[PDB]
Structure formats: structure tokens, C-alpha cells
């Protein structure tokens, strides 16, 4: 019964209690806000090819 | 606007109110020396009292070029707001 003197908690159960959650990448905040601010650029810039300024305030000609 | 308009060079604006554009009129009894100055450019012509009255003869009648309609663009401007 030498196995009953070994630590009963497995090496697996250490690696799933220490590494419980997949950690958040540093770059996943950049490349997720950048793709969402690229829609703020598109709609709201005045130099974009798809501005909403002629759709929401139609021009007086 | 109506067919006949009765304004021009009488009780007119004599000067600009801003500084972005400098207006100077010089009214005589018959004509007026206007002097406009906007940015670097300048212009000064002679406007007769019967030259401003022919201005409102053919109307401009501005109208909005909308993507879909003026109604839709006012709802979409509110959703954008």
C-alpha cells in the first residue's frame, strides 16, 4: 500500500484546478475593438466610402 | 414663396455680424456699393435697388436628395441619435 502514501490528488486534478480557465489574450481586446471601431469609422467619418451622413441628413440641393 | 416679393436694399442688413466674413454696404439713393470679404478673397459690386427685386423672380425651391425618402431619413437619424 505504498500508493496510499502518494498524494491522492492526481497530476490531472492539479492541472485542471490551476489552469481552470483559458486566459484572455492581450491582443483579443485590440482586434475585437478595432473591428468594431472600423464600423464607427465607416458610418461616421465624412471620408469613408459608406458614410451615413447622406442617409440621415439628406442634402439640400 | 409668393409671386411678388417686396424686400431688397431697403431696411437691408448693412454689415455682417460675424468675423468670418466681412460685409460692407454703402447705400446711395439709387444703388449700393457692397463690399464682401470672406477668407482671403474679396468682392465688391454695385447692386441696384431694382436688381435685388429681380432676384426673387425665379425661385430657387430647394429640395432634399434623400437615399430613400425624407421621412425615412428622419426616422433613421433618430435611431442614429
- Contact list in B for residue A58 (CB cut-off 8 A) is 64-67, 70, 73
What b/e readout covers B51-81, taking b as 16+ CB neighbours within 10 angstroms?
ebeeebeeeeeeeeebeeeeeebeebeeeee
Nearest to B50 by CA among B35, B23, B36, B30: B30
* Cα of B61 to nearest chain A Cα, Å: 9
Contact assignment for A58 to B70 by CB distance below 8 Å: yes
Q: Is A60 on the interface with B (CB under 8 A)?
A: yes
**Interacting residues of A38 by C-beta distance below 8 A, sequence separation 6+:** none
Backbone angles phi, psi at B13, to 5 degrees: -65, 125
d(CA B26, CA B15): 10
- Report B:40-69 residues touching A (Cβ under 8 A): 62-68
Find out whether B66 and A56 touch, Cβ atoms under 8 Å.
no
Of B13, B17, B11, the closest CA to residue B25 belongs to B13
Tell me phi and psi for residue A55, to 5 degrees: -95, -25
- Phi then psi for residue A19, to 5 deg, are -110, 55
Residue B38 phi, psi (nearest 5):
-130, 120
Amino acid at each position: 500500500d505504498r500508493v496510499l502514501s502518494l498524494p491522492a490528488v492526481s497530476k490531472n486534478q492539479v492541472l485542471e484546478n490551476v489552469f481552470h480557465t483559458a486566459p484572455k489574450a492581450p491582443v483579443e481586446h485590440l482586434e475585437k475593438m478595432v473591428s468594431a471601431n472600423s464600423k464607427v469609422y465607416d458610418a461616421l467619418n465624412l471620408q469613408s466610402k459608406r458614410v451615413l451622413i447622406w442617409q440621415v441628413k439628406p442634402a439640400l440641393f | 414663396l409668393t409671386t411678388f416679393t417686396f424686400s431688397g436694399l431697403q431696411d437691408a442688413p448693412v454689415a455682417a455680424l460675424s468675423g468670418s466674413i466681412k460685409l460692407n454696404v454703402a447705400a446711395k439713393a439709387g444703388k449700393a456699393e457692397v463690399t464682401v470679404a470672406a477668407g482671403a478673397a474679396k468682392a465688391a459690386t454695385q447692386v441696384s435697388a431694382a436688381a435685388l427685386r429681380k432676384l426673387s423672380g425665379s425661385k430657387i425651391s430647394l429640395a432634399e436628395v434623400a437615399r430613400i425618402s425624407v421621412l425615412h431619413s428622419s426616422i433613421q437619424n433618430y435611431l442614429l441619435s
